[PDB]
Design a binder for this molecule. Structure first.
Ligand code: CA
Ligand code: CA
Lengths: 120, 120
């Protein structure tokens, strides 16, 4: 199936995304830290990464910076921040999309499809 | 790089042209859906910024038609901001969607994502 990795410390968000993506027939992998997410990214061959930017071991922009040295996998970022400067930095660092919370699952799903079609 | 702006409102169309020319791009304009599609086919733009509220139809019709013959990235503008708005346009084939009002800096970062991904 399509493999999606979620990198997010916040347990409720992880569970919420996993249930939504599994129900659309995707295989979901999870990591709770930036460092573990990078390990899983290299391990699991995700077709897409949904990355929360507020992680306990660093700003998620550092995940993108590291990841982009060795992977072109699509990345959709999530943030509690709506600040324009944050959106610009994350996209310019290599994110493919950015959704500020709160957001609807339906929009996330549509944006997931764009990111997956384009790489197909 | 060539950008096609499909937008009947003169003010925002001019604002976008001068913003994008300021980053060194060449700008083409169209103020109806039909002329937009024709410009898109003849000028081979690297991207299209599409307003959904045109005098001769819904820009979703523009997108559906375009996508039979072109993979050029399309970023939609619209005053429409409901989630269902965004889902319909993305599913039709748009690459991104920004509701108005928006920050120019955010639009430009989103244009760059589309550029690097369609140069791959
Ligand atoms: Ca978090
Ligand atoms: Ca209009």
């Amino acid at each position: 199936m399509t493999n999606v990795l979620i990198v997010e410390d916040e347990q409720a968000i992880r569970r919420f995304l996993r249930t939504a993506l599994e129900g659309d027939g995707m295989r979901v992998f999870e990591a709770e830290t930036l460092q573990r997410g990078l390990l899983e990214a290299a391990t699991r061959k995700p077709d897409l990464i949904i990355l929360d930017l507020g992680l306990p071991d660093g700003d998620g922009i550092e995940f993108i910076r590291d990841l982009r040295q060795w992977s072109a996998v699509p990345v959709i970022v999530l943030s509690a921040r709506s600040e324009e400067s944050d959106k610009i930095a994350a996209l310019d660092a290599g994110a493919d999309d950015y959704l500020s919370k709160p957001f609807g699952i339906g929009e996330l799903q549509a944006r997931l499809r764009v990111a997956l079609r384009r790489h197909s």
